[PDB]
């Protein structure tokens, strides 16, 4: 089997992605963040607390014939925000491919975050299911669920700049890239889809090797990097500063941004200037968030949004994962 699903920009700073999914039956369609950092599958719900709700579209299992409780099992993820509540299993479908008995986890609570962003209403989580946060007993992803069934092991994230993009579960649409895939090696050990890029260039500046260990992170907006890296990129753009009471770098609206290139193996990905501008910093102001920031106080690099729209990027979920990417 196989599935495909159109995936949409949030708003017009692509400061995330939704995917449209049917859960229950009658279906019940809800908008969700495909999050390829993080492995549960959680909806806003009948139950979650009226004043925690905004405009979302909710999962109401006692309205559909297929859900069931998960009896004395709860889930509780943090990410600054967080979620938690109870679970059911239900029939979920996404883009033609269906899983029965799907753990969805249904919200009792949500913290502001994400009450305040009305366009989402839960997250579809596609890391590996050693981090799914149900307990007592752990449940697995929607990919884990499927893959027996598809066609091929895999799903790839072809997301849009300022422009829809697709999510394929189970081949590789070759029509989709440019030139050839490059594969490297995952390592699971936290549960991430982590590698390690091969280096990076500033502009049409010359290409430093460095080995860069990050994860591939769909529900990440920004490109996290070392200090080093993002110091070298943010010195390009003349007035560009780190503030600290903004929490990252900004720079001149009207400045220019040059692009930013990352290595996969020998391969290169080339994210476009325009990427890595997040507009004003409050409305009205002419000073500018950037999209490259640095991961000093997270503690591992995230190839967020920024970095994967600018490619085709395959994920192999095969008995040893691997992770592919390709221009676009
Ligand atoms: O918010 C992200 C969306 N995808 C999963 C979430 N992860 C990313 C990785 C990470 C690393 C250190 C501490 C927290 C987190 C949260």
Request: contains cysteine; aromatic residues 12%.
């Amino acid at each position: 089997s196989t599935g495909s699903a159109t995936t949409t920009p949030i708003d017009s700073l692509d400061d995330a992605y939704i995917t449209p999914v049917q859960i229950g039956t009658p279906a019940q369609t809800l908008n969700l963040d495909f999050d390829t950092g993080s492995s549960d599958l959680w909806v806003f719900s009948s139950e979650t607390t009226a004043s925690e709700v905004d405009g979302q579209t909710i999962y109401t299992p006692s309205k559909s014939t297929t859900a069931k409780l998960l009896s004395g099992a709860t889930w509780s993820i943090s990410y600054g925000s967080s979620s938690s509540g109870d679970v059911y299993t239900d029939t979920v479908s996404v883009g033609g491919l269906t899983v029965t008995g799907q753990a969805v986890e249904s919200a009792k609570k949500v913290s502001s975050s994400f009450t305040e962003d009305s366009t989402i209403d839960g997250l579809l989580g596609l890391a590996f299911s050693t981090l799914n946060t149900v307990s007592p007993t752990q449940q697995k992803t929607f990919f884990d669920n499927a893959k027996a069934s598809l066609d091929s092991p895999v799903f790839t994230a072809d997301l849009g700049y300022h422009a829809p993009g697709t999510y394929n579960f189970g081949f590789i649409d070759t029509t989709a890239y440019t030139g050839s895939i490059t594969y490297t090696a995952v390592s699971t050990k936290q549960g991430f889809w982590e590698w390690t890029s091969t280096g990076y260039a500033v502009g049409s500046g010359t290409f430093k090797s460095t080995s860069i260990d990050g994860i591939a992170d769909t529900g990440t907006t920004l490109l996290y990097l070392p200090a080093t890296v993002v110091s070298a990129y943010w010195a390009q753009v003349s007035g560009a500063k780190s503030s600290s009471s903004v929490g990252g770098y900004v720079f001149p609206c009207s400045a220019t941004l040059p692009s930013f290139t990352f290595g996969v193996g020998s391969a290169r990905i080339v994210i476009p200037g325009d990427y890595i501008d997040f507009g004003p910093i409050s409305t009205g102001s002419s000073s500018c968030f950037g999209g490259i920031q640095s991961s000093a106080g997270i503690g591992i690099n995230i190839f967020g949004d920024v970095a994967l729209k600018a490619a085709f990027v395959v994920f192999n979920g095969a008995t040893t994962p691997t992770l592919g990417f390709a221009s676009k």
